[PDB]
């Protein structure tokens, strides 16, 4: 918003860093269509996707791969976006934001990835500008949610193909919400089988899944709200760009991510029920190993106490040779055997 | 420090005049870069205590696995043990067939089968 | 695709200058900051200067400072480092390279040299 | 002035093993720490950037690790090409300084 970049320490004026980890891959897909046509375009030459600018017709552009700050730097030097947006486009460690200003819109989202047999969370930053006729939009790595609004403007399916550049905002966000709901069904999918697992057997990866669970859904909650908040900003007033004619379409997104945080509550309360489930049946686990060793314990100090009698090395014995000793301190260890086994009986250990 | 910073370079009285408020902006720009790092350390740090209940916390349980396994089956060889060996030392003194073997073989029997009853639901 | 030239040295008596060119093809000098590294005869790699276009900001290691000069054309895509009171002990292949700034946490960056050139020779 | 001590001066291994060359920092470098290949005769390839981050384009078997101010590389699974010098290059002050080099031999 303001002129002035931010001033780093340790870095020279005016300089700008991308902030996440991929460095892989680069690559621009321009998506160019029309009422009556259509064009598709992949190249790594950004001189070929700037005269796009100022096309009447609705232009899509999308360029994977951001570590490569100077095209980043030509985009937004060409478009016009300040260098404050092109610092936030960069910058990765950021809550999902809307921001609005005389000649673009610039929206900062999240998308998700969750992964099979290793319970990972991933976390990539998109970024949308709605500029004139043209709607720019970075990516940190090769793959997206956006490939049904592909098919959808390659078929002419729907009516995106007739509508100007903001039902495509529109069709990307929403896209992206989608995408939330199928990670929200991957991720109840987990929660049963963890919770399947906790409650049948107790292990230590028992409560490592389950608190990397609870991390994952905390920080779905923290990426999730501002989501909210920025799509409300997005269907309120929204005066300069966006046509009056798609706020309904906004709305319904905004109901979708209202359901998409309480789902998301609700699983944090499972979890926190998971965890309590999990202490409960380990000290029960614990109480029964602890029954067990007190049964054989109790059954059996008295019993070396008894072998220790008649086990001293003394002059006078009274039972000295007496006969069936051995047969009737056998009958006393019996009788006290079902004695203590009968009592212990009582209190049903 | 961050809310002195942005004093100084918001309000700008004509004592620290025009010419240097953009020295006080970089300094705000460093001190918001200070926060934020220590916002993200707290979090790291929060994290890490957890992860030391989670591996304490998951020790006990084999230390008390052991001590009771240890315990259950030493205790009754023990008394066995000590009936076949006192200064008392009333037995059948023909020996029959090889005592002392015998004696090892009950110890090992019942020493498996204490074994095999164990971990039967997993508890060990 | 990117790519580092040198040119610009191989022989100067003791006190003498010379400069250095570094000529760069498949980027702009005004994106990015290119550094100056010199090995000695059988020695190690050794740090001299760096500069970012963009801002013209320069930074020297202590061993040179104040006798060579580091600067940048945006239009001709070249970088230079013109040295001065050149000693023997400044023979070396000095190498020309690309660096990207990276990210640490919000208080500490590094930058890393990816896009090395091949390098030329002085005495 | 920040000075990286890269120990040992040179090494010698197999093809095949586990080799783990280390480097020390003489104050505080939080992870701009970066290693270096360079063949005899030509110029250096990068291979690891963050002290952990391995560079696009150079094979899995190289890794890098930090430990407070003790940064390690290491190759899990050595192979005939991966003869060279090796440094540990700090990069939090604005004055860049190498390290000594460990050269890897059969």
């Known amino acids: 918003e303001e002129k002035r970049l931010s001033a780093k320490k340790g870095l020279p004026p005016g300089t700008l860093v991308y902030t996440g980890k991929y460095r892989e891959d680069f690559e621009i897909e321009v998506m160019n269509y029309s009422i009556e046509e259509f064009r598709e375009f992949k190249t790594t030459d950004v001189e070929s996707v700037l005269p796009f600018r100022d096309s009447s017709t609705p232009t899509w552009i999308n360029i994977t791969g951001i570590h490569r700050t100077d095209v980043v730097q030509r985009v937004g030097e060409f478009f016009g976006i300040h260098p404050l947006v092109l610092e936030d486009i960069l910058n990765v460690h950021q809550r999902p934001k809307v921001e609005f200003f005389e000649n673009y819109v610039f929206i900062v989202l999240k998308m998700f990835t969750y992964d099979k047999n290793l319970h990972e969370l991933e976390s990539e930053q998109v970024s949308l500008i709605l500029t004139k006729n043209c709607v720019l939009m970075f990516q940190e790595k090769i793959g997206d949610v956006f490939d049904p609004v592909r098919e959808r403007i390659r078929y002419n399916r729907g009516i995106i193909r007739k509508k100007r550049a903001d039902y495509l905002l529109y069709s990307l966000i929403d896209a992206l919400v989608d995408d939330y709901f199928v990670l929200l069904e991957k991720i109840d999918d987990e929660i049963d089988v963890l919770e399947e697992e906790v409650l049948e057997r107790p292990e230590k990866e028992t409560v490592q899944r389950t608190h990397q669970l609870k991390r994952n859904l905390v920080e779905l909650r923290k990426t999730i709200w501002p989501l909210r908040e920025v799509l409300s900003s997005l269907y309120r007033d929204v005066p300069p760009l966006i046509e009056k004619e798609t706020v309904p379409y906004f709305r319904d997104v905004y109901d979708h991510t209202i359901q998409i945080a309480d789902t998301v509550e609700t699983f944090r309360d499972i979890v926190s029920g998971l965890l309590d489930v999990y202490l409960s049946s380990v000290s029960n686990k614990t109480n029964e190993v602890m029954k067990v060793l007190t049964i054989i314990a109790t059954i059996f100090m008295p019993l070396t106490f008894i072998a220790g009698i008649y086990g001293m090395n003394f002059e006078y014995m009274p039972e000295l040779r007496w006969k069936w000793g051995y047969p009737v301190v056998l009958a006393v260890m019996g009788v006290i055997a079902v004695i203590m086994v009968v009592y212990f009986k009582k209190k049903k250990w | 420090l961050r809310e002195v910073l942005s004093s100084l370079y918001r309000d700008v009285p004509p004592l620290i005049e025009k010419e240097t408020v953009p020295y006080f902006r970089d300094v705000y720009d460093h001190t918001i870069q200070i926060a934020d790092t220590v916002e993200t350390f707290r979090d790291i740090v929060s994290g890490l205590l957890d992860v030391y209940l989670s591996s304490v916390s998951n020790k006990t349980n084999e230390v008390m696995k052991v001590l009771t396994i240890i315990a259950t089956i030493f205790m009754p060889l023990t008394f066995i043990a000590g009936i076949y060996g006192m200064n008392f030392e009333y037995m059948p003194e023909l020996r029959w067939k090889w005592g002392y073997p015998v004696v090892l073989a009950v110890m090992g029997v019942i020493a498996v089968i204490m074994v095999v009853y164990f971990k039967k639901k997993k508890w060990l | 695709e990117v790519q580092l030239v040198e040119s610009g040295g191989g022989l100067v008596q003791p006190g003498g200058s010379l400069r250095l060119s570094c000529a760069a093809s498949?980027?702009?000098?005004?994106?990015?900051?290119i550094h100056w590294v010199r090995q000695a005869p059988g020695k190690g790699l050794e740090w001299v200067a760096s500069?970012?276009?963009?801002?013209?900001?320069?930074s020297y290691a202590d061993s040179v400072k104040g006798r060579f000069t580091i600067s940048a054309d945006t239009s001709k895509n070249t970088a230079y480092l013109q040295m001065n009171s050149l000693r023997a002990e400044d023979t070396a292949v000095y190498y020309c390279a690309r660096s990207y700034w990276y990210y640490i946490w919000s208080y500490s960056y590094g930058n890393a040299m990816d896009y090395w050139g091949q390098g030329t020779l002085v005495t | 002035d920040i000075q990286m001590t890269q120990s040992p001066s040179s090494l010698s291994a197999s093809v095949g093993d586990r080799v783990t060359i280390t480097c020390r920092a003489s104050?505080?470098?939080?992870?701009?720490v970066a290693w270096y290949q360079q063949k005899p005769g030509k110029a250096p390839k990068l291979l690891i950037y963050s002290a952990s981050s391995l560079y696009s384009g150079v094979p899995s078997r190289f890794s890098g690790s930090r430990s407070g101010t003790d940064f390690t590389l290491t190759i899990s699974s050595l192979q005939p090409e991966d003869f060279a010098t090796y440094y540990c290059?700090?990069?939090?002050?604005?004055?860049?300084?190498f390290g000594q080099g460990t050269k890897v031999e059969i």
């Open positions: 290059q700090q990069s939090s002050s604005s004055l860049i300084t």
């Open positions: 104050q505080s470098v939080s992870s701009a």
């Open positions: 500069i970012s276009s963009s801002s013209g900001s320069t």
């Open positions: 498949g980027f702009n000098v005004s994106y990015y900051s």
